Design an enzyme around this catalytic site. Structure first.
Site, PDB file in Angstrom:
ATOM      1  N   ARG B  20      47.711   1.435 -61.451  1.00 15.16           N
ATOM      2  CA  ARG B  20      48.708   1.513 -60.726  1.00 15.16           C
ATOM      3  C   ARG B  20      49.093   0.471 -61.328  1.00 15.16           C
ATOM      4  N   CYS B  41      39.229   9.872 -50.112  1.00 13.39           N
ATOM      5  CA  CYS B  41      40.046   9.104 -48.828  1.00 13.39           C
ATOM      6  C   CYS B  41      41.634   9.891 -48.693  1.00 13.39           C
ATOM      7  N   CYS B  46      39.305   9.907 -44.931  1.00 15.35           N
ATOM      8  CA  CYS B  46      40.517   9.535 -44.055  1.00 15.35           C
ATOM      9  C   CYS B  46      41.273  10.098 -43.720  1.00 15.35           C
ATOM     10  N   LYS B  49      40.452  13.618 -42.095  1.00  8.10           N
ATOM     11  CA  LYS B  49      39.635  13.119 -40.347  1.00  8.10           C
ATOM     12  C   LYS B  49      40.510  12.684 -39.985  1.00  8.10           C
ATOM     13  N   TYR B 180      29.420   5.666 -38.230  1.00  7.80           N
ATOM     14  CA  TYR B 180      30.542   5.643 -37.773  1.00  7.80           C
ATOM     15  C   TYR B 180      30.889   7.116 -37.954  1.00  7.80           C
ATOM     16  N   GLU B 184      31.792   9.955 -35.658  1.00  6.94           N
ATOM     17  CA  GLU B 184      33.910  10.419 -35.388  1.00  6.94           C
ATOM     18  C   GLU B 184      33.256  11.546 -35.424  1.00  6.94           C
ATOM     19  N   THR B 322      38.345   2.752 -47.686  1.00 11.10           N
ATOM     20  CA  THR B 322      39.632   3.304 -48.834  1.00 11.10           C
ATOM     21  C   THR B 322      40.405   1.829 -48.992  1.00 11.10           C
ATOM     22  N   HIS B 450      52.965  -7.923 -22.037  1.00 13.60           N
ATOM     23  CA  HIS B 450      53.072  -7.329 -20.989  1.00 13.60           C
ATOM     24  C   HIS B 450      53.962  -6.138 -20.506  1.00 13.60           C
ATOM     25  N   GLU B 455      47.321  -7.393 -24.878  1.00 12.98           N
ATOM     26  CA  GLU B 455      47.699  -8.655 -24.261  1.00 12.98           C
ATOM     27  C   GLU B 455      46.438  -9.422 -23.920  1.00 12.98           C
TER      28      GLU B 455
HETATM   29  C1  LIG Z   1      62.551  -2.594 -14.169  1.00  9.70           C
HETATM   30  C2  LIG Z   1      62.160  -4.096 -14.386  1.00  9.70           C
HETATM   31  C3  LIG Z   1      61.296  -3.654 -15.846  1.00  9.70           C
HETATM   32  C4  LIG Z   1      60.451  -4.985 -16.230  1.00  9.70           C
HETATM   33  N1  LIG Z   1      59.827  -4.567 -17.430  1.00  9.70           N
HETATM   34  C5  LIG Z   1      58.691  -5.653 -18.100  1.00  9.70           C
HETATM   35  C6  LIG Z   1      58.094  -5.664 -18.624  1.00  9.70           C
HETATM   36  O1  LIG Z   1      57.566  -4.027 -19.535  1.00  9.70           O
HETATM   37  N2  LIG Z   1      57.408  -6.440 -19.283  1.00  9.70           N
HETATM   38  C7  LIG Z   1      58.075  -7.801 -19.332  1.00  9.70           C
HETATM   39  O2  LIG Z   1      57.694  -9.008 -19.599  1.00  9.70           O
HETATM   40  N3  LIG Z   1      58.692  -8.412 -18.392  1.00  9.70           N
HETATM   41  C8  LIG Z   1      59.134  -6.963 -17.438  1.00  9.70           C
HETATM   42  N4  LIG Z   1      60.421  -7.966 -16.336  1.00  9.70           N
HETATM   43  C9  LIG Z   1      60.913  -8.876 -16.307  1.00  9.70           C
HETATM   44  C10 LIG Z   1      59.733  -9.185 -15.303  1.00  9.70           C
HETATM   45  O3  LIG Z   1      59.759  -8.630 -14.232  1.00  9.70           O
HETATM   46  C11 LIG Z   1      60.610 -10.534 -14.630  1.00  9.70           C
HETATM   47  O4  LIG Z   1      60.697 -11.722 -15.694  1.00  9.70           O
HETATM   48  C12 LIG Z   1      59.084 -11.066 -14.165  1.00  9.70           C
HETATM   49  O5  LIG Z   1      58.559 -10.317 -12.606  1.00  9.70           O
HETATM   50  C13 LIG Z   1      59.918 -12.452 -13.233  1.00  9.70           C
HETATM   51  O6  LIG Z   1      58.954 -13.149 -12.271  1.00  9.70           O
HETATM   52  P1  LIG Z   1      59.910 -14.800 -11.410  1.00  9.70           P
HETATM   53  O7  LIG Z   1      58.003 -15.095 -11.029  1.00  9.70           O
HETATM   54  O8  LIG Z   1      60.785 -15.463 -11.620  1.00  9.70           O
HETATM   55  O9  LIG Z   1      60.400 -13.125 -10.291  1.00  9.70           O
HETATM   56  P2  LIG Z   1      59.655 -12.354  -9.700  1.00  9.70           P
HETATM   57  O10 LIG Z   1      58.494 -11.328  -9.617  1.00  9.70           O
HETATM   58  O11 LIG Z   1      60.966 -11.895  -8.933  1.00  9.70           O
HETATM   59  O12 LIG Z   1      59.372 -13.534  -8.220  1.00  9.70           O
HETATM   60  C14 LIG Z   1      60.115 -13.619  -7.089  1.00  9.70           C
HETATM   61  C15 LIG Z   1      59.573 -13.881  -5.874  1.00  9.70           C
HETATM   62  O13 LIG Z   1      60.375 -14.423  -4.756  1.00  9.70           O
HETATM   63  C16 LIG Z   1      60.302 -13.866  -3.277  1.00  9.70           C
HETATM   64  N5  LIG Z   1      61.395 -15.099  -3.114  1.00  9.70           N
HETATM   65  C17 LIG Z   1      62.940 -14.949  -3.446  1.00  9.70           C
HETATM   66  N6  LIG Z   1      63.642 -15.458  -2.907  1.00  9.70           N
HETATM   67  C18 LIG Z   1      62.700 -16.497  -1.835  1.00  9.70           C
HETATM   68  C19 LIG Z   1      63.226 -17.501  -0.513  1.00  9.70           C
HETATM   69  N7  LIG Z   1      64.161 -17.875  -0.340  1.00  9.70           N
HETATM   70  N8  LIG Z   1      61.616 -17.749   0.619  1.00  9.70           N
HETATM   71  C20 LIG Z   1      60.688 -16.699  -0.287  1.00  9.70           C
HETATM   72  N9  LIG Z   1      60.274 -15.970  -1.487  1.00  9.70           N
HETATM   73  C21 LIG Z   1      61.366 -15.751  -1.779  1.00  9.70           C
HETATM   74  C22 LIG Z   1      61.169 -12.280  -3.668  1.00  9.70           C
HETATM   75  O14 LIG Z   1      60.966 -12.213  -2.788  1.00  9.70           O
HETATM   76  C23 LIG Z   1      59.540 -12.517  -4.602  1.00  9.70           C
HETATM   77  O15 LIG Z   1      58.901 -12.077  -4.559  1.00  9.70           O
HETATM   78  C24 LIG Z   1      60.803  -6.285 -15.973  1.00  9.70           C
HETATM   79  C25 LIG Z   1      62.226  -6.024 -15.204  1.00  9.70           C
HETATM   80  C26 LIG Z   1      62.550  -4.906 -14.852  1.00  9.70           C
HETATM   81  C27 LIG Z   1      63.283  -5.310 -13.210  1.00  9.70           C
HETATM   82  C1  LIG Z   2      34.238  11.647 -43.692  1.00  5.90           C
HETATM   83  C2  LIG Z   2      34.561  10.692 -44.407  1.00  5.90           C
HETATM   84  C3  LIG Z   2      36.021   9.621 -43.221  1.00  5.90           C
HETATM   85  C4  LIG Z   2      36.372   8.568 -43.891  1.00  5.90           C
HETATM   86  N1  LIG Z   2      37.146   7.824 -43.425  1.00  5.90           N
HETATM   87  C5  LIG Z   2      37.205   6.713 -43.843  1.00  5.90           C
HETATM   88  C6  LIG Z   2      38.457   6.027 -42.626  1.00  5.90           C
HETATM   89  O1  LIG Z   2      38.849   6.591 -42.060  1.00  5.90           O
HETATM   90  N2  LIG Z   2      39.479   4.502 -43.269  1.00  5.90           N
HETATM   91  C7  LIG Z   2      38.519   3.607 -45.040  1.00  5.90           C
HETATM   92  O2  LIG Z   2      38.944   3.022 -45.051  1.00  5.90           O
HETATM   93  N3  LIG Z   2      37.464   4.646 -45.426  1.00  5.90           N
HETATM   94  C8  LIG Z   2      36.900   5.749 -44.476  1.00  5.90           C
HETATM   95  N4  LIG Z   2      36.051   6.415 -45.489  1.00  5.90           N
HETATM   96  C9  LIG Z   2      35.483   5.869 -46.595  1.00  5.90           C
HETATM   97  C10 LIG Z   2      36.779   6.208 -48.471  1.00  5.90           C
HETATM   98  O3  LIG Z   2      37.189   7.027 -48.150  1.00  5.90           O
HETATM   99  C11 LIG Z   2      36.079   5.455 -49.409  1.00  5.90           C
HETATM  100  O4  LIG Z   2      35.370   4.476 -49.397  1.00  5.90           O
HETATM  101  C12 LIG Z   2      36.829   5.636 -49.972  1.00  5.90           C
HETATM  102  O5  LIG Z   2      36.981   6.847 -50.471  1.00  5.90           O
HETATM  103  C13 LIG Z   2      35.958   5.042 -51.607  1.00  5.90           C
HETATM  104  O6  LIG Z   2      37.193   5.447 -53.106  1.00  5.90           O
HETATM  105  P1  LIG Z   2      36.239   5.369 -54.218  1.00  5.90           P
HETATM  106  O7  LIG Z   2      38.033   4.638 -55.339  1.00  5.90           O
HETATM  107  O8  LIG Z   2      35.539   4.279 -54.506  1.00  5.90           O
HETATM  108  O9  LIG Z   2      36.216   6.349 -54.878  1.00  5.90           O
HETATM  109  P2  LIG Z   2      36.383   8.363 -54.229  1.00  5.90           P
HETATM  110  O10 LIG Z   2      37.924   8.364 -53.905  1.00  5.90           O
HETATM  111  O11 LIG Z   2      34.744   8.664 -53.967  1.00  5.90           O
HETATM  112  O12 LIG Z   2      37.007   8.256 -55.754  1.00  5.90           O
HETATM  113  C14 LIG Z   2      35.845   8.900 -57.089  1.00  5.90           C
HETATM  114  C15 LIG Z   2      36.621   9.422 -57.516  1.00  5.90           C
HETATM  115  O13 LIG Z   2      36.048  10.146 -59.468  1.00  5.90           O
HETATM  116  C16 LIG Z   2      35.663  11.415 -59.256  1.00  5.90           C
HETATM  117  N5  LIG Z   2      34.859  11.162 -60.096  1.00  5.90           N
HETATM  118  C17 LIG Z   2      33.283  10.608 -60.125  1.00  5.90           C
HETATM  119  N6  LIG Z   2      32.499  10.845 -61.115  1.00  5.90           N
HETATM  120  C18 LIG Z   2      33.418  11.062 -62.206  1.00  5.90           C
HETATM  121  C19 LIG Z   2      33.514  11.046 -63.716  1.00  5.90           C
HETATM  122  N7  LIG Z   2      31.980  10.945 -64.125  1.00  5.90           N
HETATM  123  N8  LIG Z   2      34.181  11.653 -64.163  1.00  5.90           N
HETATM  124  C20 LIG Z   2      35.357  11.360 -63.087  1.00  5.90           C
HETATM  125  N9  LIG Z   2      35.709  11.874 -62.807  1.00  5.90           N
HETATM  126  C21 LIG Z   2      34.919  11.227 -61.681  1.00  5.90           C
HETATM  127  C22 LIG Z   2      35.803  11.855 -57.981  1.00  5.90           C
HETATM  128  O14 LIG Z   2      35.913  13.024 -58.657  1.00  5.90           O
HETATM  129  C23 LIG Z   2      36.591  11.521 -56.919  1.00  5.90           C
HETATM  130  O15 LIG Z   2      37.882  11.584 -57.565  1.00  5.90           O
HETATM  131  C24 LIG Z   2      36.206   7.435 -45.020  1.00  5.90           C
HETATM  132  C25 LIG Z   2      34.506   8.493 -46.420  1.00  5.90           C
HETATM  133  C26 LIG Z   2      34.337   9.727 -45.408  1.00  5.90           C
HETATM  134  C27 LIG Z   2      33.184  10.413 -46.400  1.00  5.90           C
END
Ligand SMILES: Cc1cc2nc3c(=O)[nH]c(=O)nc-3n(C[C@H](O)[C@H](O)[C@H](O)COP(=O)(O)OP(=O)(O)OC[C@H]3O[C@@H](n4cnc5c(N)ncnc54)[C@H](O)[C@@H]3O)c2cc1C
Ligand SMILES: Cc1cc2nc3c(=O)[nH]c(=O)nc-3n(C[C@H](O)[C@H](O)[C@H](O)COP(=O)(O)OP(=O)(O)OC[C@H]3O[C@@H](n4cnc5c(N)ncnc54)[C@H](O)[C@@H]3O)c2cc1C
EC number: 1.8.1.7
Lengths: 461, 461
Positions: B20, B41, B46, B49, B180, B184, B322, B450, B455
């Site tokens: 190609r 593959c 691949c 599997k 492997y 698998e 592959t 987070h 992470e």
């Molecule tokens: C629903 C939800 C989902 C979220 N999901 C994610 C996520 O998946 N990933 C992510 O990265 N972020 C997420 N966030 C954002 C993340 O949680 C906040 O950015 C992070 O908690 C902020 O930390 P901080 O230390 O500033 O404050 P906070 O953890 O709020 O801490 C402030 C603390 O100070 C205390 N406090 C406040 N005032 C006073 C005071 N005067 N005296 C004493 N203690 C006090 C509070 O009680 C509290 O314990 C999410 C937020 C929410 C609301």
């Molecule tokens: C069970 C299994 C799982 C695998 N899982 C993964 C995976 O998850 N990730 C990954 O990266 N690799 C995986 N592999 C490895 C990957 O599939 C092989 O490395 C890749 O297919 C090799 O490509 P190739 O082009 O060398 O040969 P192949 O794809 O075998 O191609 C060779 C081709 O040449 C043809 N051929 C052979 N001789 C002749 C001839 N004389 N005249 C005309 N045609 C001919 C054959 O029919 C075939 O079609 C796995 C292999 C197996 C067996």
């Protein structure tokens, strides 16, 4: 007045990470926490969310059971079972975090901190005073809710916090918002069997992501049975005889507005934004600068405008992610206690995964952003769309879309965007490559892993 | 004697890829194929599997259904259902490949090729002669089977080829080999319900992988219900009244040998090796060099010892994957038809995924290999072992193990080895990073995603 080397206000991701690294460096640190350690990520965020996602993922996979040669799986999901297990797991984590602090010799001060009127920056917790030459504010944020003044009955709805309190699967649920949290919640509720609607103000979700992703994500939701109510917003909410009734206005452009009532709603979930937790800190006693939403303003090194006062994480309002708060908190400890003055977090190329169905992974610039940064003439994208091999034998189908954004002649990889089965675990190493400044030749010169979805990114043409 | 620019013998991965690319470059090419296009593959490797793996993966996930809040799924897997669907999918691929060739204007010569006695290298297929100034041998390999002379009754067993012909799930199956393919097949048969034994000559499987992986992989198999028969080999096989009876010798070192009969065996699967397909090529008429297994010897550019004769893929006996056959076939076309003399495949840092349960991903040097290349004093490894969050709520458990091998002061990443849920899709981008020469700082400086398994690789300490 007890004195420490480092006082951290907030025991969530950023606050704990920073305190722990500082302590490794010899600092005598104390963490003030008014609620549960672990903060948002462990209690009402990342962790419980992921568990619920794994659950929703089970629901979808069970739809493919018969296609795979097995007998049809028949039923009803039991919310309380998983809820109880999820709570337990969160309980296990809270205990670990507490132990981590203790092993590090970090003092935990339990209670709500606030700055004092005192000259040298000093906080008060439960009547006692505490001071340090370096104080980190890491108080995080909270879910935003509408004012009853603007949307009457808004207080009848819940937030993502309330979602983690639910004990039964709501029969009918309406989610308002179009950001990642809204998307995630809609996807979980729907997969688990709730009749779910997602109400967005425009026509697509995730409008800040690359446009291939917002489009694809919107379609995947519809395909999964989520009703996306476009150009719609809530006008009022009321408690009827049996659930809630949501009054909404739909205003498609080029059309007359139309008002609709949504009846028999069990769960109204506001997923409209997050607000910083700074309100009760008495920041103004020190004149610490905030923006008009209440975010603390900091520089590239996390400094506030006051010497010896820093802020990291959600409270700063930028890149609201657990790992960013951690990384920024750590870099900050190295700067303060290891004297590494250049120590700071690079906010570019931070990768994100959105736990939708299928999940989304993104890192770097969207096509539009690259276009604004380099110019249309200097941006080239590569993309693919295919049906993962997993669905070769299923009636149900999902797609995988990938897009690579390159810049300049060299085709530097400046953005990677994808949605598809396995994209949640696929992103990390490409994020490493992107951070290192890989070009397309670097990808192309990496031998593919067959058969996988991931191999598509190294064989784009 | 029909003349072409390029004649490719074998229409599998390497042969098609090369043909190609050559055609894109203006070459007038023809592909000789004696069986089905797509070669190993698509037909018996691949693809089929992976489909069987996805199926086995469904079986395991179904064990966790009740833990996830759903009702227990009850039953019997139906082999023929999936077998029929798998065959169909292979049929779809064969038709696509054929179409790909046609759209490219590549001629398909159907039949078995062999070299002629002729001076200028010439082949014969079905009485007709064909010649080209560049001829690629890409005939692949085949499964190896024991000689009846050494193991009487060996011909009662099947190979991986025969596995893809099975129409019913064998009740009792014995797999012989520790590579492997053996792993698998054992994992698929076991997950689908066959009472499976894996018979290996030593104490671990995958003995050429990093030792953390061979150890972990051996344990995961046992934990999944596969009986690993260590230090064992087959002495004879016989057809009894109801199945096969396998006589084996177990010789644990420090112990007396013990002979055991394994009765009522439905399926005996030899997964002991692969042999190159060169036997019927009449290579000797051109004096083309082979090793003693029949592999064609080539240089770094895929040249044989005869001018204008090349070989790629399995037939060469190195890196039997592959994607390697494809990449080598492509680089070769660029060298021959684009005059890129430096065009060749780098055989270092080729990533591999083993579709075990959980899957394995490896790229680069094992710890021992790095130790031999750089010296113990210059090798540092980092590793982690944890239970993925997916199992936080399951009774059934699997582990995730990751290991990073670094070299020199700079801590260059020279090897990544892992086993765990999601590792099949996780490897690709880290393989890109490794190929680019990343160091540990490059990983460490990439913000984590987070909450994911991936992470862990960017937060090793
Ligand atoms: C629903 C939800 C989902 C979220 N999901 C994610 C996520 O998946 N990933 C992510 O990265 N972020 C997420 N966030 C954002 C993340 O949680 C906040 O950015 C992070 O908690 C902020 O930390 P901080 O230390 O500033 O404050 P906070 O953890 O709020 O801490 C402030 C603390 O100070 C205390 N406090 C406040 N005032 C006073 C005071 N005067 N005296 C004493 N203690 C006090 C509070 O009680 C509290 O314990 C999410 C937020 C929410 C609301
Ligand atoms: C069970 C299994 C799982 C695998 N899982 C993964 C995976 O998850 N990730 C990954 O990266 N690799 C995986 N592999 C490895 C990957 O599939 C092989 O490395 C890749 O297919 C090799 O490509 P190739 O082009 O060398 O040969 P192949 O794809 O075998 O191609 C060779 C081709 O040449 C043809 N051929 C052979 N001789 C002749 C001839 N004389 N005249 C005309 N045609 C001919 C054959 O029919 C075939 O079609 C796995 C292999 C197996 C067996």
């Amino acid at each position: 007045v007890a004195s420490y080397d480092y006082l951290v206000i907030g025991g969530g991701s950023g606050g704990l990470a920073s305190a722990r690294r500082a302590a490794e460096l010899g600092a005598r640190a104390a963490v003030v926490e008014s609620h549960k350690l672990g903060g948002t990520c462990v209690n009402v965020g990342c962790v419980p969310k992921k568990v619920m996602w794994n659950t929703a993922v089970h629901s979808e996979f069970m739809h493919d059971h018969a296609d795979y040669g097995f007998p049809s799986c028949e039923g009803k999901f039991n919310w309380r079972v998983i809820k109880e297990k999820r709570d337990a797991y969160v309980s296990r984590l809270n205990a670990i975090y507490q132990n981590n602090l203790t092993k590090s010799h970090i003092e935990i001060i339990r209670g709500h901190a606030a700055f004092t009127s005192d000259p040298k920056p000093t906080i008060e917790v439960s009547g006692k005073k505490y001071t340090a030459p370096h104080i980190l504010i890491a108080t995080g944020g909270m879910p935003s809710t509408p004012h009853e003044s603007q949307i009457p009955g808004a207080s009848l709805g819940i937030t993502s916090d309330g979602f983690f309190q639910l004990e039964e699967l709501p029969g009918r649920s309406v989610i308002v918002g179009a950001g990642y949290i809204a998307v995630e919640m809609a996807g979980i509720l729907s997969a688990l069997g709730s009749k779910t609607s997602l109400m967005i103000r425009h026509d697509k979700v995730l409008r800040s992501f690359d446009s291939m992703i917002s489009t694809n994500c919107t379609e995947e939701l519809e395909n999964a049975g989520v009703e996306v109510l476009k150009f719609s917003q809530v006008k009022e909410v009321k408690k009827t005889l049996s659930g809630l009734e949501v009054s909404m206005v739909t205003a498609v452009p080029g059309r007359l507005p139309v008002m609709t009532m949504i009846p028999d709603v069990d769960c109204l979930l506001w997923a409209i934004g997050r607000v910083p937790n700074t309100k009760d800190l008495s920041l103004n006693k020190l004149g610490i600068q905030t923006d008009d939403k209440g975010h603390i303003i900091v520089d590239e090194f996390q400094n506030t405008n006051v010497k010896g006062i820093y802020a990291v994480g959600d409270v700063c309002g930028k890149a609201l992610l657990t790992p960013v708060a951690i990384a920024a908190g750590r870099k900050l400890a190295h700067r303060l206690f290891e004297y590494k003055e250049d120590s700071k977090l690079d906010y570019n190329n931070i990768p994100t995964v959105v736990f939708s169905h299928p999940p989304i992974g993104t890192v770097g610039l969207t096509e539009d952003e690259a276009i604004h940064k380099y110019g249309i003439e200097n941006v080239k994208t590569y993309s693919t769309s295919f049906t993962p091999m997993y669905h070769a034998v299923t009636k149900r189908k999902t797609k995988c879309v990938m897009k690579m954004v390159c810049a300049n002649k060299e085709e530097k990889v400046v953005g990677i965007h994808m949605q598809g089965l396995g994209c949640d675990e696929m992103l990390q190493g490409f994020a490493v490559a992107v951070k290192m400044g890989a070009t397309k030749a670097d990808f192309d010169n990496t031998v593919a892993i067959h058969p996988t979805s991931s191999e598509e990114l190294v064989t784009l043409r």
